[PDB]
Write a protein that binds this ligand. Structure first.
Ligand SMILES: CN[C@@H]1CCc2c(ccc(O)c2O)[C@H]1O
Length: 281
């Protein structure tokens, strides 16, 4: 009686993610006003979100819904690698877009000359290359396989597909994909908040007769709530077996996917973007 209940939600979230990515991608392309030296990272993030929503969400949702991986063996590793690459690229591009704002605010008078059109493409290409180096190479090549006899049949059986990894690969991927960008964001935004508070205090002392706090807290809360628990349990389950169950793991993995559907709605509020959106409707 509840088989179609999850399908409606999955279809709605897939359509929302697809529309949110496509609208931003076309809005950046059509109008020259929004084209700047900092919107390229937003374009890459939107493209990655669109690819993830188009390639990972439907196949995965079908996998849980029918409870059978009726597709072939070769497609399973390809799907897993696509998901890993998309997640890593999104995290890395978020870190880059935060570092860019840190450079913009913390040290002015050289940001205009330091950054240019050529540097942004090199940076994003290096980011995607680093993401791919840990995405296709360890997956397509038969590594990371579990030595314990369980799931060896799943590897052999074409019908059954499931995620089983070694401890070393899991911990290395978690470290190289999650924690370093989080620390970078924490330090960057602490410095930015300190600078903003200093400026506000200077203005208040100068002219006698928090928006920044809110706009930072919303982003930090969204990112932490969306992505923190998944890696928190990913680091621990491999370390000690039988600590967690599979249902909680897959539920956290799925709730981790909702973040991609929020980025267009939370990284676009400038009046130029509003005018561009109004120019379509
Ligand atoms: C099946 N979904 C996977 C599971 C584990 C994992 C993901 C993404 C990046 C990683 O570094 C991971 O270890 C997820 O996309």
């Amino acid at each position: 009686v509840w088989v179609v209940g999850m399908g409606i939600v999955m279809s709605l979230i897939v359509l929302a993610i697809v529309f949110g990515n496509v609208l931003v991608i076309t809005a950046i392309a059509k109008f020259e006003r929004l084209q700047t030296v900092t919107n390229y990272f937003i374009t890459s993030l939107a493209c990655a979100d669109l690819v993830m929503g188009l390639a990972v969400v439907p196949f995965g949702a079908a996998h849980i819904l029918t409870k059978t991986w009726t597709f072939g063996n070769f497609w399973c590793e390809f799907w897993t690698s696509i998901d890993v690459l998309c997640v890593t690229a999104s995290i890395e591009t978020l870190c880059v877009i935060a570092v860019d704002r840190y450079f913009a605010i913390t040290s002015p008078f050289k940001y205009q000359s330091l950054l240019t059109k050529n540097k942004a493409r090199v940076i994003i290409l290096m980011v995607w290359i680093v993401s791919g180096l840990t995405s296709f190479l360890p997956i397509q090549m038969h590594w990371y396989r579990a030595t314990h006899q369980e799931a060896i049949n799943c590897y052999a059986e074409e019908t059954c597909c499931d995620f089983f990894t070694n401890q070393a690969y899991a911990i290395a991927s978690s470290i190289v994909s999650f924690y370093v960008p989080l620390v970078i964001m924490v330090f960057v935004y602490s410095r930015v908040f300190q600078e903003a508070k200093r400026q506000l205090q200077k203005i208040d002392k100068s002219e006698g007769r928090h928006k920044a706090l809110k706009t930072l807290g919303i982003i930090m809360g969204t990112f932490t709530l969306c992505w923190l628990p998944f890696f928190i349990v990913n680091i621990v389950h491999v370390i000690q077996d039988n600590l967690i169950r599979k249902e909680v793991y897959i539920l956290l993995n799925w709730i981790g996917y909702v973040n991609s559907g929020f980025n267009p709605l939370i990284y676009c509020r400038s009046p130029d973007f509003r005018i561009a959106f109004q120019e379509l409707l």
